[PDB]
Design a protein around this ligand. Structure first.
Ligand code: R78
Length: 113
């Protein structure tokens, strides 16, 4: 009722709900919550990744309407993927998992009306 920007943000809300849903859990689960570098014994993670990002943080910010437009939302989602590509060996399973989830994200985002 408030126009294209309101509709875009609601569509992005729906993308996020799908990425968090059981449908994609085989590959999305490493991205549900912030990386716990202490628990994973990754003593270099925060030295390499300066801006951690994950789906629960995107959800908090999106629910608080902290993204001014859909491009702001997309930047944080893509930052999450980019962190995974930057930190891990390129042939690691987690990179393939990030790419499977990004395939979903980019497909849905491309079809935003
Ligand atoms: C932060 C680096 C990278 C990344 O980018 N993200 C996003 C990530 C997000 N979440 C996780 N989470 C878990 C990852 C592995 C395990 C696990 O159970 N590993 C077993 C432990 C015993 N044995 C060695 C066999 C394997 C549990 C996890 O959550 C509790 N891992 C992530 N990885 C991986 C971390 C090391 C390789 C890559």
């Amino acid at each position: 009722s408030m126009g294209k920007l309101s509709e875009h943000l609601r569509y992005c809300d729906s993308i996020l709900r799908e990425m968090l849903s059981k449908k994609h859990a085989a590959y999305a689960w490493p991205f549900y919550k912030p990386v716990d570098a202490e628990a994973l014994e990754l003593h270099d993670y925060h030295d390499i990744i300066k801006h951690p990002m994950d789906l629960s943080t995107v959800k908090r910010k999106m629910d608080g309407r902290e993204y001014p437009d859909a491009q702001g939302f997309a930047a944080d989602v893509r930052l999450m993927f980019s962190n995974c590509y930057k930190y891990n060996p390129p042939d690691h399973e987690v990179v393939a998992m990030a790419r499977k989830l990004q395939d979903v994200f980019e497909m849905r985002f491309a079809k935003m009306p």
